[PDB]
Design an enzyme around this catalytic site. Structure first.
Site, PDB file in Angstrom:
ATOM      1  CD  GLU A 169      50.289 -29.550   9.593  1.00 35.17           C
ATOM      2  OE1 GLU A 169      50.639 -28.291   9.679  1.00 35.17           O
ATOM      3  OE2 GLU A 169      50.460 -30.217   8.585  1.00 35.17           O
TER       4      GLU A 169
ATOM      5  CG  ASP B 251      52.004 -23.021   4.542  1.00 32.12           C
ATOM      6  OD1 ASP B 251      52.678 -22.138   3.919  1.00 32.12           O
ATOM      7  OD2 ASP B 251      51.376 -23.862   3.953  1.00 32.12           O
TER       8      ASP B 251
END
Ligand SMILES: [Cl-]
Ligand SMILES: [Cl-]
Length: 162
Positions: free
Chosen positions: A11, A20
């Site tokens: 991540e 994202d």
């Protein structure tokens, strides 16, 4: 290597609101804020999550705190889920981490939808599960990260992360 180090590699860490891979507002270590297109709706969710007026920026400690909550929640969601729990109970420690990673990424509902893959994992048909896991929007959209999780399921080792 452990679940935390694994997800931190996958991540990354960002201290400012960012979008994202799906274009959603996120912060810290993959902590989704909102799917709404509003940056303001994102700052609002953020301040609420942190308990202070952040102006879209958080500290490393704050990021790690959301991360710990998120991992804890992923684990508890798996254990509460009738479809996921039996899979998780059947796996070894390494593969358990791969399942947590998928749940962290796509949510419990998302994962529970991989019916055929889940059955194969439960059956310990590693190569087959790896093939089926790859026939998914998930793999097609984030292939490098998906391959790392898939390999973990296939091998039962942390090789993909080293
Ligand atoms: Cl939260
Ligand atoms: Cl990727």
């Amino acid at each position: 290597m452990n679940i935390f180090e694994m997800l931190r590699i996958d991540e990354g860490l960002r201290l400012k609101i960012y979008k994202d891979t799906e274009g959603y507002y996120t912060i810290g270590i993959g902590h989704l804020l909102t799917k709404s297109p509003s940056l303001n709706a994102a700052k609002s969710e953020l301040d609420k999550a942190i308990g202070r007026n952040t102006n879209g920026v958080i500290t490393k400690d704050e990021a790690e705190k959301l991360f710990n909550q998120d991992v804890d929640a992923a684990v508890r969601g798996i254990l509460r889920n009738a479809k996921l729990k039996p899979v998780y109970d059947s796996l070894d420690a390494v593969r358990r981490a791969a399942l947590i990673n998928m749940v962290f990424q796509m949510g419990e509902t998302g994962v529970a939808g991989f019916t055929n893959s889940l059955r194969m994992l439960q059956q310990k048909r590693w190569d087959e599960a790896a093939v089926n896991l790859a026939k998914s929007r998930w793999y097609n959209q984030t292939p490098n990260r998906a391959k790392r999780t898939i390999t973990t399921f296939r091998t039962g080792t942390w090789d993909a992360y080293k």
